[PDB]
Nucleic acid binder design. Sequence first.
RNA 1: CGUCAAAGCACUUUGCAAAAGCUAACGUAUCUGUUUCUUGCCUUUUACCAGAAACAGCCGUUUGUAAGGUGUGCUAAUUUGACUGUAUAGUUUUUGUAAUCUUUU
Lengths: 293, 98, 96, 193, 144, 99, 193
Amino acid sequence: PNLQMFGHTAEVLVARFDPSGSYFASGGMDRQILLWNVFDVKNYGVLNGCKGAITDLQWSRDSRVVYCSSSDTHLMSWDAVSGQKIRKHKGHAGVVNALDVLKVSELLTSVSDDCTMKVWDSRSKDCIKTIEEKYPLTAVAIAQQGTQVFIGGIDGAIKIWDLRNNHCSHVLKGHKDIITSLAISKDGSSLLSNSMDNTVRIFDVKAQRQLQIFEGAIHGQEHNLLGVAWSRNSRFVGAGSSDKNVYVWSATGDLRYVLPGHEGSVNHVDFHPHQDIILSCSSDRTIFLGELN
Amino acid sequence: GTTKMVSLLNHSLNVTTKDGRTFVGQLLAFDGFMNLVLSDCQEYRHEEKRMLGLVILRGEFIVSLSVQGPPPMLLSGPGVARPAGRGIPLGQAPVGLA
Amino acid sequence: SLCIKLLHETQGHIVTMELENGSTYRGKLIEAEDNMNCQMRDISVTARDGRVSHLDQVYIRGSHIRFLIVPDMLRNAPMFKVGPGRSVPLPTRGRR
Amino acid sequence: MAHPKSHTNRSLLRQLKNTKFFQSTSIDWVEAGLQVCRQGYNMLQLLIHRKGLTYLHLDYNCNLKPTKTLTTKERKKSRFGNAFHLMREILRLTKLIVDSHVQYRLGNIDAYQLADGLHYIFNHVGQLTGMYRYKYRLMRQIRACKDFKHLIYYRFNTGPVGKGPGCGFWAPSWRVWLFFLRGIVPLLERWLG
Amino acid sequence: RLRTSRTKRPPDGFDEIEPTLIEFQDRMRQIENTMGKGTKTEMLAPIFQLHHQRSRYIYDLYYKREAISTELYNWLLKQNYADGNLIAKWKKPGYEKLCCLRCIQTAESKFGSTCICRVPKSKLDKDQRVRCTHCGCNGCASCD
Amino acid sequence: VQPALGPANPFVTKEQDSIKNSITGYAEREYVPNFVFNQEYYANTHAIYGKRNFDDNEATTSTDLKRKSQKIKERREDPGDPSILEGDGAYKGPWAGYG
Amino acid sequence: QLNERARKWRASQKSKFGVKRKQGYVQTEKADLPPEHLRKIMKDRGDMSSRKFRADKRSYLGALKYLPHAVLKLLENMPMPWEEYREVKVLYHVTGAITFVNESPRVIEPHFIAQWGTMWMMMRREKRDRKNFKRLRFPPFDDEEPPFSIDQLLDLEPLEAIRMDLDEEDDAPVMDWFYENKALEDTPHVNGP
RNA sequence: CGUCAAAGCACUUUGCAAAAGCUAACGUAUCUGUUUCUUGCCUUUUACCAGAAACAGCCGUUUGUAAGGUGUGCUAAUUUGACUGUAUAGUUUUUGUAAUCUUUU
């Protein structure tokens, strides 16, 4: 099958599976996160409260608590079993754009239009660290180790920071413009990155040079943050584009699947943790589950 | 105050007394004098045991407190699915341009 | 306070207790107090020695009591919220 | 009495306020009485002329009459219907209630006379407005307003000071005619539509 | 909002303002009662324009020159001499010289929004400067 | 992709060759945020006016906006001010005319 | 070059999320107009004679459907004897095609009883001490005569109306509001407006 | 009154949902219509008389929730909840009758 489920009122942004592979969550401009099943593809809770639009979901690695990143500074927290509020992580003085989580579900990183990175504990309700750069930040990724945090800004310079040192250790180079989504592999050994130059580049974690520049997935005037993912094997790379197409790569530098279906710009493509399924979201208010037999 | 003391409520406790004896069981009720009520109690005089049941201790008699164990023990949103389809667009290029 | 009301509720039943004296007393309880006085009948004392005796009527001082031992059905009894300006727990319809 | 049904609130007068064709403002009552009384005059005139029925003229006191004197062939075209006439005679009433305020804001009348005035109107609507001949139920709203008069007069009038005019305790006699429009409005749209 | 003899008098400062406020009423009747000329949309333009002046007067007397007591300024609004809804916007930045509340309604416009007047002269063309249809705005933008 | 294959019809005039949903051309739904469309539309119009104007009118800038406002601003008549119905002071408002 | 990147970025984020902003535009409340705006339309349109408004005339009949509903809002607002005039609210068709009175009378009940009782005090007293009570003429204005110019009535001044002599010593805690429209709208003795 | 927690607050405009759960005024108010029957006054049908049952409309009311508007504060104010909320060195608990030694198994 394919399954193009409808439900949201307005532009949807982010849609992700549990780490387990038993649910979706989705939510964009609706101010409504809508949970789903995978295997009778039905809705669940209408997580209501966020007074800004959602920009990023992420399941806790317990598969119970959910975290948002509203446009009104809040980062909310939700008990996916019951569906009640837990907290309002009040901090930033602007619009949050990305979130990331660890193994230990306890630490979270967010990224504002205040040019401020901030690490959060799920127990304090306050910031543990505050890394002020200069130009409004956009994408962030934290490693599996719980050590390296990658920041993506407007300079095209993916900076790398550790939790012990807090020094500008390294800076990725050769990306001319804008970053819309970082993504660390299931190894902890390589990033993915969507630039506004349409060069969906991979980078190294440890020597730190490029690997493979992919090219063929356009951003334009919309200025949405488009996403990228690593497949459960780390064989395939799934980048969406404003051309209504989900450009899946071969990770060897070869375009295999280029499946259309959406009527509007695509945002955050994902992969299921085990069985080969693709979550693809788009302003359109629609979502697909593209499979491979 | 007594904010901490309410937190202990319904936990299995180990209570040492001035006599030396140590009572054990859950905590049902608590006081400003530290009168404790305890459920299914067992003294350990010392290789010894006794079964009492419900025990109400005074404040004079109690020395220390210590937890043995922890406390004992949105329907469907609008969304709907559909099947497949995957239409091809005649045009290429981005969404806003043309 | 609730630790006193539970006592008053076991009036009528048979109770065991321990005093600073060292001896334990067992009998039907007739009256209690907020002080922790007691009034019992048909008591069967047992000291440190093991010496049994009979006492027809007894009064006590709470100060002298170490701890009581109460019947089992007295764990399902209600434990109320009380209030700032009330002596006895009781249930409360009014404000709070 | 039924016990009321569960429902969401429709409210017509806040739908019209949500389109770009209606605007809102605050004015004096008697202005907006005249406003209506006029609006209705025209809304009938434009209907009378669109039918090309231009040998009859409505007076400004909602009084319809022929000038020419007609053939039987030219009368059958006139023959306006049970609705239009009911709609008309509901205007004839609105005119009296409003005029009789206009008139007290010249000085002509003075308050105590005006209250009485108002009261006479409701209590006599059978006689000022020849409406009952297009909607015969109406002779129930009439009969009631008469059966208030009796009840009041023989409680107020009598005292030591009873014969003629004065009264002006209209509130009950007024009610009757509101609750009537509650039930007519809905029907009289359907008929006019 | 008509006040008469045998009523509550207004606050002390009022009767200095009296002449000017009558000056407006007198002019306003003169527009109502006269006939227009152009389109029936244009015909009503000089009401809004005048109405804007009556409120600016009072917005001037309380916030800049300071020739009125808070007691009076409030009395003026709750007597409808000046539109508060409007004056509220004059306090907010961006609207510091706005024409008519009707030029800032997204929901009136065929699509989109905002009486062309509301656009800062900078951007739009020489050909489409023209004038608004509602009120006859002409660069209500706070600056241009 | 899978191409068609065959000899290709030789007659085929210009009018037949295009794939048309609705006679003139193919028409399909779009999902562009409106702000992008409004932003896009204005820029295109200026170019069209400019050719008719025959003037490029320089490039859009920062700070020079203030120069462009002032240049427009200076010609425009001074506001009458409140409280003057009459002229010689008078109260031209935003209504005021540049000249 | 980086300074300009962000300037473009921030604006695009501002159109998407933007403090007080709907999908793109800035939403607002439908603010009500000046009173003269409506009053002019009535004068300019007149009797729907001139060609300049030959468009409207289609709508004007369209209104007819909702006339019976305008009558009914108007009468459920009639000003009451003790009031000198009463201000109201309105919906008008920008066409000058109808005026809907958009308030409900709304009143606090023991008070309103009191008032109407106090009428029935004056109204009996006044009937006994008048002698020559001149009841209204009706069809207040003659058939032929065209309706009243609104602008004439705005000059007249209102004239005084019923009420009762409330001595300060005794009726102290009601005298300052026992004859308003929305009594104590400003105090904490009521919600708000 | 006191603590703690949450939240801007009061006032207001629209949208969207609901409103016998254990016999009870969503509205201490109250009007029109349709169908099916029964009787009135009647022969032109409508328009009506005044009872029933079954459906409907209309004029209103309450609540929750979403987005807004005005005034005020976001270096504060207000609301809302929650609570095992009082102060005792002199006899019944928190300013000690404790301290110490020795023998038996």
